[PDB]
Design a protein around this motif. Sequence first.
Motif, PDB file in Angstrom:
ATOM      1  N   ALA A  33       0.848  -1.201   0.000  1.00 49.36           N
ATOM      2  CA  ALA A  33       0.000   0.000   0.000  1.00 49.36           C
ATOM      3  C   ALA A  33       0.879   1.245   0.000  1.00 49.36           C
ATOM      4  O   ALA A  33       1.521   1.564   1.005  1.00 49.36           O
ATOM      5  CB  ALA A  33      -0.918   0.007   1.233  1.00 49.36           C
ATOM      6  N   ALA A  36       2.042   3.522   3.179  1.00 50.47           N
ATOM      7  CA  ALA A  36       1.959   2.878   4.495  1.00 50.47           C
ATOM      8  C   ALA A  36       3.302   2.904   5.228  1.00 50.47           C
ATOM      9  O   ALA A  36       4.360   2.801   4.604  1.00 50.47           O
ATOM     10  CB  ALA A  36       1.484   1.447   4.351  1.00 50.47           C
ATOM     11  N   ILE A  39       5.273  -1.080   8.223  1.00 49.55           N
ATOM     12  CA  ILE A  39       5.853  -2.069   7.323  1.00 49.55           C
ATOM     13  C   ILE A  39       7.125  -2.828   7.702  1.00 49.55           C
ATOM     14  O   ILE A  39       7.661  -3.562   6.874  1.00 49.55           O
ATOM     15  CB  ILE A  39       6.068  -1.417   5.930  1.00 49.55           C
ATOM     16  CG1 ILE A  39       7.096  -0.281   6.046  1.00 49.55           C
ATOM     17  CG2 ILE A  39       4.721  -0.890   5.392  1.00 49.55           C
ATOM     18  CD1 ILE A  39       7.287   0.563   4.768  1.00 49.55           C
TER      19      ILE A  39
ATOM     20  N   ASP C   1      19.005  16.278  11.050  1.00 53.34           N
ATOM     21  CA  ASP C   1      19.445  17.328  12.013  1.00 53.34           C
ATOM     22  C   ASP C   1      18.903  18.672  11.553  1.00 53.34           C
ATOM     23  O   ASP C   1      18.863  18.960  10.357  1.00 53.34           O
ATOM     24  CB  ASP C   1      20.974  17.354  12.085  1.00 53.34           C
ATOM     25  CG  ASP C   1      21.550  16.042  12.596  1.00 53.34           C
ATOM     26  OD1 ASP C   1      20.945  14.983  12.324  1.00 53.34           O
ATOM     27  OD2 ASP C   1      22.609  16.067  13.259  1.00 53.34           O
TER      28      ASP C   1
ATOM     29  N   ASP D   1       5.148   7.922  -3.559  1.00 56.63           N
ATOM     30  CA  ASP D   1       6.435   7.196  -3.355  1.00 56.63           C
ATOM     31  C   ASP D   1       7.525   8.211  -3.045  1.00 56.63           C
ATOM     32  O   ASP D   1       7.554   9.300  -3.619  1.00 56.63           O
ATOM     33  CB  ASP D   1       6.782   6.395  -4.612  1.00 56.63           C
ATOM     34  CG  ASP D   1       5.741   5.330  -4.923  1.00 56.63           C
ATOM     35  OD1 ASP D   1       4.549   5.562  -4.625  1.00 56.63           O
ATOM     36  OD2 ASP D   1       6.109   4.270  -5.472  1.00 56.63           O
ATOM     37  N   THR D  31      15.059   8.324  10.433  1.00 53.08           N
ATOM     38  CA  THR D  31      16.421   7.869  10.156  1.00 53.08           C
ATOM     39  C   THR D  31      16.408   6.582   9.345  1.00 53.08           C
ATOM     40  O   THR D  31      17.383   5.831   9.338  1.00 53.08           O
ATOM     41  CB  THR D  31      17.224   7.630  11.470  1.00 53.08           C
ATOM     42  OG1 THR D  31      16.470   6.796  12.359  1.00 53.08           O
ATOM     43  CG2 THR D  31      17.530   8.955  12.162  1.00 53.08           C
ATOM     44  N   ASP D  32      15.304   6.352   8.633  1.00 54.47           N
ATOM     45  CA  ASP D  32      15.137   5.138   7.845  1.00 54.47           C
ATOM     46  C   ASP D  32      15.857   5.167   6.505  1.00 54.47           C
ATOM     47  O   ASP D  32      15.255   4.924   5.451  1.00 54.47           O
ATOM     48  CB  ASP D  32      13.644   4.869   7.647  1.00 54.47           C
ATOM     49  CG  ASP D  32      12.908   4.716   8.969  1.00 54.47           C
ATOM     50  OD1 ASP D  32      11.689   4.985   9.024  1.00 54.47           O
ATOM     51  OD2 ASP D  32      13.556   4.324   9.960  1.00 54.47           O
ATOM     52  N   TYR D  50      20.117   2.504   8.992  1.00 52.94           N
ATOM     53  CA  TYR D  50      19.425   3.488   9.807  1.00 52.94           C
ATOM     54  C   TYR D  50      20.231   4.755  10.035  1.00 52.94           C
ATOM     55  O   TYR D  50      20.474   5.172  11.169  1.00 52.94           O
ATOM     56  CB  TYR D  50      18.990   2.864  11.137  1.00 52.94           C
ATOM     57  CG  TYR D  50      17.780   1.980  10.952  1.00 52.94           C
ATOM     58  CD1 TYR D  50      17.898   0.598  10.871  1.00 52.94           C
ATOM     59  CD2 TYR D  50      16.514   2.546  10.771  1.00 52.94           C
ATOM     60  CE1 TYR D  50      16.783  -0.203  10.611  1.00 52.94           C
ATOM     61  CE2 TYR D  50      15.406   1.762  10.511  1.00 52.94           C
ATOM     62  CZ  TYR D  50      15.546   0.389  10.434  1.00 52.94           C
ATOM     63  OH  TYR D  50      14.431  -0.378  10.194  1.00 52.94           O
ATOM     64  N   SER D  67      18.937  13.130   9.620  1.00 52.20           N
ATOM     65  CA  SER D  67      17.603  12.679   9.971  1.00 52.20           C
ATOM     66  C   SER D  67      16.642  13.626   9.263  1.00 52.20           C
ATOM     67  O   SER D  67      17.027  14.723   8.850  1.00 52.20           O
ATOM     68  CB  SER D  67      17.385  12.724  11.495  1.00 52.20           C
ATOM     69  OG  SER D  67      17.360  14.054  11.988  1.00 52.20           O
ATOM     70  N   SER D  91      13.363   3.074   3.841  1.00 52.89           N
ATOM     71  CA  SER D  91      12.429   2.040   4.259  1.00 52.89           C
ATOM     72  C   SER D  91      11.363   2.622   5.180  1.00 52.89           C
ATOM     73  O   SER D  91      10.729   1.895   5.935  1.00 52.89           O
ATOM     74  CB  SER D  91      13.175   0.911   4.982  1.00 52.89           C
ATOM     75  OG  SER D  91      13.872   1.400   6.120  1.00 52.89           O
ATOM     76  N   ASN D  92      11.156   3.930   5.107  1.00 51.73           N
ATOM     77  CA  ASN D  92      10.161   4.581   5.957  1.00 51.73           C
ATOM     78  C   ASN D  92       8.733   4.322   5.492  1.00 51.73           C
ATOM     79  O   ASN D  92       7.839   4.086   6.313  1.00 51.73           O
ATOM     80  CB  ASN D  92      10.406   6.093   6.000  1.00 51.73           C
ATOM     81  CG  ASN D  92       9.499   6.803   7.004  1.00 51.73           C
ATOM     82  OD1 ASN D  92       9.700   6.712   8.221  1.00 51.73           O
ATOM     83  ND2 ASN D  92       8.488   7.493   6.499  1.00 51.73           N
ATOM     84  N   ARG D  93       8.511   4.382   4.181  1.00 50.79           N
ATOM     85  CA  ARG D  93       7.180   4.161   3.622  1.00 50.79           C
ATOM     86  C   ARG D  93       7.244   3.190   2.440  1.00 50.79           C
ATOM     87  O   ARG D  93       8.264   3.095   1.764  1.00 50.79           O
ATOM     88  CB  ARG D  93       6.577   5.485   3.121  1.00 50.79           C
ATOM     89  CG  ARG D  93       6.531   6.631   4.128  1.00 50.79           C
ATOM     90  CD  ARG D  93       5.514   6.408   5.246  1.00 50.79           C
ATOM     91  NE  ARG D  93       5.361   7.611   6.067  1.00 50.79           N
ATOM     92  CZ  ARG D  93       4.359   8.486   5.963  1.00 50.79           C
ATOM     93  NH1 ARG D  93       3.387   8.309   5.071  1.00 50.79           N
ATOM     94  NH2 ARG D  93       4.338   9.555   6.752  1.00 50.79           N
ATOM     95  N   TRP D  94       6.149   2.484   2.185  1.00 44.86           N
ATOM     96  CA  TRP D  94       6.091   1.546   1.064  1.00 44.86           C
ATOM     97  C   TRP D  94       5.797   2.335  -0.219  1.00 44.86           C
ATOM     98  O   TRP D  94       4.951   3.235  -0.216  1.00 44.86           O
ATOM     99  CB  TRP D  94       4.980   0.508   1.287  1.00 44.86           C
ATOM    100  CG  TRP D  94       5.164  -0.702   0.426  1.00 44.86           C
ATOM    101  CD1 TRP D  94       5.932  -1.800   0.713  1.00 44.86           C
ATOM    102  CD2 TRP D  94       4.678  -0.891  -0.912  1.00 44.86           C
ATOM    103  NE1 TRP D  94       5.958  -2.650  -0.364  1.00 44.86           N
ATOM    104  CE2 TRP D  94       5.199  -2.119  -1.374  1.00 44.86           C
ATOM    105  CE3 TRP D  94       3.857  -0.140  -1.762  1.00 44.86           C
ATOM    106  CZ2 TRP D  94       4.930  -2.617  -2.659  1.00 44.86           C
ATOM    107  CZ3 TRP D  94       3.587  -0.634  -3.043  1.00 44.86           C
ATOM    108  CH2 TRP D  94       4.127  -1.865  -3.476  1.00 44.86           C
ATOM    109  N   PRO D  95       6.488   2.012  -1.331  1.00 43.99           N
ATOM    110  CA  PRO D  95       7.508   0.960  -1.417  1.00 43.99           C
ATOM    111  C   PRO D  95       8.904   1.496  -1.138  1.00 43.99           C
ATOM    112  O   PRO D  95       9.143   2.702  -1.208  1.00 43.99           O
ATOM    113  CB  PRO D  95       7.387   0.497  -2.860  1.00 43.99           C
ATOM    114  CG  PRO D  95       7.177   1.805  -3.579  1.00 43.99           C
ATOM    115  CD  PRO D  95       6.134   2.498  -2.681  1.00 43.99           C
ATOM    116  N   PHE D  96       9.828   0.589  -0.843  1.00 42.29           N
ATOM    117  CA  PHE D  96      11.215   0.974  -0.606  1.00 42.29           C
ATOM    118  C   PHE D  96      11.684   1.603  -1.917  1.00 42.29           C
ATOM    119  O   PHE D  96      11.255   1.184  -2.999  1.00 42.29           O
ATOM    120  CB  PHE D  96      12.070  -0.267  -0.283  1.00 42.29           C
ATOM    121  CG  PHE D  96      11.724  -0.949   1.028  1.00 42.29           C
ATOM    122  CD1 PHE D  96      12.299  -2.182   1.352  1.00 42.29           C
ATOM    123  CD2 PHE D  96      10.865  -0.353   1.954  1.00 42.29           C
ATOM    124  CE1 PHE D  96      12.029  -2.809   2.572  1.00 42.29           C
ATOM    125  CE2 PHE D  96      10.586  -0.967   3.176  1.00 42.29           C
ATOM    126  CZ  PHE D  96      11.169  -2.198   3.490  1.00 42.29           C
TER     127      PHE D  96
END
Lengths: 103, 103, 106, 106, 219
Positions: A33, A36, A39, C1, D1, D31-32, D50, D67, D91-96
């Motif tokens: 999704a 989202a 995950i 930051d 995205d 920090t993803d 991270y 960050s 990798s914070n939100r889909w999709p990567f």
Amino acid sequence: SALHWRAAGAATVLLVIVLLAGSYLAVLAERGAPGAQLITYPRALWWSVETATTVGYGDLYPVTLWGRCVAVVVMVAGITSFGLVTAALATWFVGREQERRGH
Amino acid sequence: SALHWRAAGAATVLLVIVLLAGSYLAVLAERGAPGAQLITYPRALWWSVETATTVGYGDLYPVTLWGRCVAVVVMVAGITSFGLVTAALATWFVGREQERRGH
Amino acid sequence: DILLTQSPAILSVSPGERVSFSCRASQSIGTDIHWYQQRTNGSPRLLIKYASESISGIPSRFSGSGSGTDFTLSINSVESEDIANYYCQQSNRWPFTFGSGTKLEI
Amino acid sequence: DILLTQSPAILSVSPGERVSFSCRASQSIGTDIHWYQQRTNGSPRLLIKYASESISGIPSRFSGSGSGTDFTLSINSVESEDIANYYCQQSNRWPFTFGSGTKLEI
Amino acid sequence: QVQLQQPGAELVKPGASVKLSCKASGYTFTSDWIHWVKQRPGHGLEWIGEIIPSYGRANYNEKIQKKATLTADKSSSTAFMQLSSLTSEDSAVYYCARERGDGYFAVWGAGTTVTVSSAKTTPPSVYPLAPGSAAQTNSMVTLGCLVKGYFPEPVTVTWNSGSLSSGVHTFPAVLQSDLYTLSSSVTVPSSSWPSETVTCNVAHPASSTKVDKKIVPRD
Ligand SMILES: CCCCCCCCCO
Ligand SMILES: CCCCCCCCCO
């Protein structure tokens, strides 16, 4: 020993199980999704706890139908479990007071 | 006097202690994490209270593993304490009603 | 930051006139900004805390304002002793960060 | 995205000097962010996770910071083996998603 | 009283390391954090890291190469910063500051000037500066003292043990042949000198020396 203490124990074990399964299932439901954030598993487990306690900071939450269904199960499991503990505490206090009154 | 009143009192004192320790520990756990906001004591104490009451506005929250563990302790302490007070109130009402019925 | 931008780097004012220093944050930080004064060869000195709170011992001609991303340090009727470098610093998110500073010239 | 912008596309540095790669996200992602190194004809290799977490087996001269929307991968005293393409990934939100990559030249 | 005490200077050879100290006074709380800030000559303030003495946990600026290691001695109320394997890029003034856990630096130390060089420590020669016999004077007279041949920076020059502050200018030092030289000038009413004594006090922390030089009219 008594039924209430046993029930409270079982509820706590049941909750931990729901927290773990909910975390796993939330990720499964939310990936796919666009947008989202629920995950990855570590944060999904954190999400399950703040959902079960009804704190819901809003840092993480489900956006899909199935993630939301999973969320409702976690919510109900948490509310019911904590509520059951409250009921067990009440039973304990009621029994002790009856003794204290010599009833 | 009665066990429930004593338990409620102890729970309230225990909660205040958890709120203070949680505030201190949350800051200790969160500083060092880029982006964290639960990093000064005055607001951390405010955070501990809205967490213990399960309000969780979302103005502040932990982002690290240890800050989240601290949060869970505060959550459980708050829910349990308030729940214990509810159980104490129930015991008081139950005893008074038994008297009223002449039991 | 969080990045704190202080521009201009140098501010020139006539004696007795009001002057204002600017500090802009890269993201919204409420009122978690503090201001320091540093004279030649001296250590920084806290002037204003939490955007507008006065500090004991600091002349009344010093005041601060702002919230969100834009903050201002103002000096009513600037005088010789005000000649110095001024820095803003944020404490909203980790780690604490400093602006590049603005120099006051009379 | 989420769009990850890596600029400049090529970075030229003298041997032994410190170098920094930039990765900017189209929206705030905590920090993803993770960094990979890919040498000519090789497979990508995880360097930092991270934003700033070191990985076992990666030289200590590699570090990351940042960050929110701006991140940096830095190399203290760059050497020949560092010549490669570097990519950031979120990798914070889909999709990567992956950044377009930056090449290091010495 | 001075809340944070830091040594004035430290000379370090390239590649070597040094341990800076910051002794605290006044109220001390479990919520106190000690911070370190770096400032290169002519540059701004750069945050290095922080430590909470009550717990001993330290955090560092991730945007810069880690050259420091922070520790603290609870009994002597002293915080320490170990800088290792330094280069000329590490030469600067390092300040320690105290934060009560509420985000701002209420008090700062005087700062320790760290110079990374191979040169040797050299105390300064202090010469008096009195006007010549042909110099005509007005309502005021200007005197001074020459401080030269010292290393490394800095030196602190005061007049009459600090009691004389108005009318004083101390010029920035100039480097030549691995040695610094600067002058300080003071202006007092012509009627007060040499009736009232005027002396310049020169402290050079790097060599633990402090000398005085009285300024008297030329014979
Ligand atoms: C009780 C709710 C179960 C929800 C399971 C969701 C599975 C999603 C798979 O794509
Ligand atoms: C019961 C949870 C205790 C958590 C303590 C966290 C300490 C973090 C230190 O860095």
